[PDB]
Design an enzyme around this catalytic site. Structure first.
Site, PDB file in Angstrom:
ATOM      1  N   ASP A 128       2.737   8.143  -0.540  1.00  0.00           N
ATOM      2  CA  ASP A 128       2.751   8.412  -1.972  1.00  0.00           C
ATOM      3  C   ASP A 128       4.093   7.944  -2.537  1.00  0.00           C
ATOM      4  OD1 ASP A 128       1.624   9.315  -4.405  1.00  0.00           O
ATOM      5  OD2 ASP A 128       2.136  11.474  -4.033  1.00  0.00           O
ATOM      6  N   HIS A 176       2.766  -1.133  -4.471  1.00  0.00           N
ATOM      7  CA  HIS A 176       1.621  -1.290  -3.586  1.00  0.00           C
ATOM      8  C   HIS A 176       1.850  -2.394  -2.548  1.00  0.00           C
ATOM      9  CE1 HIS A 176      -0.160   1.598  -6.126  1.00  0.00           C
ATOM     10  NE2 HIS A 176      -0.878   0.819  -6.902  1.00  0.00           N
ATOM     11  N   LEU A 228      -0.423   1.238  20.484  1.00  0.00           N
ATOM     12  CA  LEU A 228      -0.571   2.329  19.542  1.00  0.00           C
ATOM     13  C   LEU A 228      -1.863   2.139  18.759  1.00  0.00           C
ATOM     14  CD1 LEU A 228       1.968   4.065  17.351  1.00  0.00           C
ATOM     15  CD2 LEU A 228       0.235   2.738  16.148  1.00  0.00           C
TER      16      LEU A 228
HETATM   17  C1  LIG Z   1      -1.630   4.507  -1.070  1.00  0.00           C
HETATM   18  C2  LIG Z   1      -2.012   4.646  -2.522  1.00  0.00           C
HETATM   19  C3  LIG Z   1      -3.479   4.850  -2.757  1.00  0.00           C
HETATM   20  C4  LIG Z   1      -1.144   4.630  -3.522  1.00  0.00           C
HETATM   21  C5  LIG Z   1       0.311   4.382  -3.401  1.00  0.00           C
HETATM   22  S1  LIG Z   1       1.303   5.826  -3.897  1.00  0.00           S
HETATM   23  P1  LIG Z   1       0.991   6.058  -5.928  1.00  0.00           P
HETATM   24  O1  LIG Z   1       0.387   4.847  -6.549  1.00  0.00           O
HETATM   25  O2  LIG Z   1       0.110   7.261  -6.141  1.00  0.00           O
HETATM   26  O3  LIG Z   1       2.434   6.332  -6.570  1.00  0.00           O
HETATM   27  P2  LIG Z   1       2.865   7.384  -7.750  1.00  0.00           P
HETATM   28  O4  LIG Z   1       2.632   8.770  -7.206  1.00  0.00           O
HETATM   29  O5  LIG Z   1       1.974   7.092  -8.926  1.00  0.00           O
HETATM   30  O6  LIG Z   1       4.326   7.095  -7.991  1.00  0.00           O
HETATM   31  C1  LIG Z   2      -3.688  10.286  -1.264  1.00  0.00           C
HETATM   32  C2  LIG Z   2      -3.192   8.871  -1.138  1.00  0.00           C
HETATM   33  C3  LIG Z   2      -3.734   8.115   0.029  1.00  0.00           C
HETATM   34  C4  LIG Z   2      -2.363   8.306  -1.997  1.00  0.00           C
HETATM   35  C5  LIG Z   2      -2.005   8.893  -3.288  1.00  0.00           C
HETATM   36  S1  LIG Z   2      -3.483   9.020  -4.341  1.00  0.00           S
HETATM   37  P1  LIG Z   2      -2.628  10.195  -5.831  1.00  0.00           P
HETATM   38  O1  LIG Z   2      -1.202   9.769  -5.990  1.00  0.00           O
HETATM   39  O2  LIG Z   2      -3.468  10.271  -7.070  1.00  0.00           O
HETATM   40  O3  LIG Z   2      -2.621  11.621  -5.094  1.00  0.00           O
HETATM   41  P2  LIG Z   2      -2.413  13.108  -5.674  1.00  0.00           P
HETATM   42  O4  LIG Z   2      -3.662  13.358  -6.491  1.00  0.00           O
HETATM   43  O5  LIG Z   2      -1.141  13.054  -6.514  1.00  0.00           O
HETATM   44  O6  LIG Z   2      -2.268  14.037  -4.497  1.00  0.00           O
HETATM   45 MG   LIG Z   3       0.753   9.135  -6.239  1.00  0.00          MG
END
Ligand SMILES: CC(C)=CCSP(=O)(O)OP(=O)(O)O
Ligand SMILES: CC(C)=CCSP(=O)(O)OP(=O)(O)O
Ligand SMILES: [Mg+2]
Ligand SMILES: CC(C)=CCSP(=O)(O)OP(=O)(O)O
Ligand SMILES: CC(C)=CCSP(=O)(O)OP(=O)(O)O
Ligand SMILES: [Mg+2]
Ligand SMILES: [Mg+2]
Lengths: 233, 239
Positions: free
Chosen positions: B24, B41, B131
């Site tokens: 994240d 990304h 792995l």
């Molecule tokens: C691995 C995925 C699905 C997303 C990358 S992390 P993110 O786009 O949610 O990043 P933010 O929480 O929006 O800063």
């Molecule tokens: C859960 C993964 C794989 C990446 C982030 S998707 P997101 O940033 O929308 O997740 P949350 O809804 O913030 O937990």
């Molecule tokens: Mg996120």
């Protein structure tokens, strides 16, 4: 067979509570282990009263897990006898009380207290307290699976009907799911509690042991919860 | 209608055997650096490769990584198409490595070009002895449990099992993420939840949360998480 792209159910409506830390708390004060366990039901009652005033509607509380059977016979018998006090503490309260878990494994002494506590309080229109006793997330998901299999065998449903909503309606803990989970006792894990139901829950872990967990500690957890939602959308 | 849980199984455990990873913090990271929306990304597959290398040396055996969730479909079409195109890089990055690569999730929803890359990446690396990297792409814990339930129902309807066979071991064998389950879960990005990842499998997993955004997560950060894990006391319900 597959398709995923094309509804799930300020203040948190449902709080889940893992009441950990009781043994360490006693052992700290030179007390015997059992002294710690004696605070569980009183504390929970106290927490329900505080929460009820705040506008909380549901508390699900972890009192005894399917893995707790692995403790000493002495410790187990003590806990299962102690849970009889659920009747005294709640029967004449304003709280509605349900139990989830495998009742048939428990002493009939305990089975009867539980059924009575449920019957007496079933009418209260206040806070709904769910007490998870001899419960586990593995158990919940498996008993729901067996029930769905039975229905399919009796021509009530097809595999194409099996979805999130169907599965939800067969679990012992149902929508609406916990908005917040509080775990006392310093450990950072869910220990086979509400596995399905915690999918989108906020997790709050405190080092405060359960017997020291008071109104101030609770209000902190809720304050922390409200800060998370300010940056959530 | 009969339960019994009294006389009983767990798939856990110096070093964690299996690490689950929620990646994240990608968009915030880019927006901070004044870069483009999707610049974050672009670090996913490289980082994962790098993390596998570090982990592999340390003696870790499995990594399950959350790359795209069932809820990610609700992002903009622009952002979605970009991510799903970018996942094609999985072949180039891993094909010639020492790492065995599996994908879990609903593959049939994905572009056919992506489906083919995945099958190829799996086939090429299936023999590697190092792995095991599991990439959860179009996955969710709800989906995993539901597809396992349907499979069990079909078997019961065809006389291949009866209700008294349905137990933890049975269910474990039907889920796409199987024993041994994660000993440690690392979530970058500062949030404290599981967001519909490995619901069944995380029952006794230790959780580590860091504020570090995923693109800044490197070897030092990883070794910290592992150090934190080694301090922890796991009782699994006993004393
Ligand atoms: C691995 C995925 C699905 C997303 C990358 S992390 P993110 O786009 O949610 O990043 P933010 O929480 O929006 O800063
Ligand atoms: C859960 C993964 C794989 C990446 C982030 S998707 P997101 O940033 O929308 O997740 P949350 O809804 O913030 O937990
Ligand atoms: Mg996120
Ligand atoms: C038995 C209940 C209700 C909760 C767990 S408290 P405990 O006896 O596990 O105490 P410690 O975790 O050993 O401090
Ligand atoms: C809170 C209750 C009743 C059960 C789960 S806590 P526990 O101490 O049994 O759990 P761990 O051994 O710390 O996983
Ligand atoms: Mg404990
Ligand atoms: Mg899902």
């Amino acid at each position: 067979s597959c398709s995923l792209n094309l509804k799930l159910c300020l203040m948190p409506k449902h709080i889940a509570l893992i009441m950990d830390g009781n043994r360490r708390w006693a052992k700290d004060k030179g007390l015997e282990v059992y002294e710690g366990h004696k605070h569980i039901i009183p504390k929970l009652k106290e927490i329900c009263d505080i929460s009820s005033k705040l506008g909380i509607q549901i508390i699900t509380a972890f009192a005894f897990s399917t893995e707790n059977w692995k403790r000493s016979k002495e410790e187990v018998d003590f806990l299962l006898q102690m849970f009889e006090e659920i009747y005294d503490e709640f029967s004449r309260s304003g709280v509605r009380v349900s139990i989830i878990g495998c009742k048939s494994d428990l002493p009939m002494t305990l089975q009867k207290c539980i059924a009575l506590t449920e019957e007496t309080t079933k009418g209260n229109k206040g806070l709904h307290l769910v007490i998870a006793l001899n419960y586990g997330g593995y158990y919940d998901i498996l008993q729901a699976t067996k029930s769905i299999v039975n229905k399919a065998m009796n021509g009530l449903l097809d595999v194409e009907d099996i979805n999130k909503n169907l599965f939800d309606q067969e679990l012992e803990s149902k929508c609406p799911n916990p908005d917040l989970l509080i775990r006392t006792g310093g450990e950072q894990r869910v220990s086979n509690f509400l596995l399905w139901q915690l999918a989108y829950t906020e997790f709050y872990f405190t080092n405060t042991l359960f017997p020291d967990f008071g109104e101030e500690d609770l209000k902190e957890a809720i304050m922390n919860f409200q800060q998370r939602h300010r940056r959530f959308g």
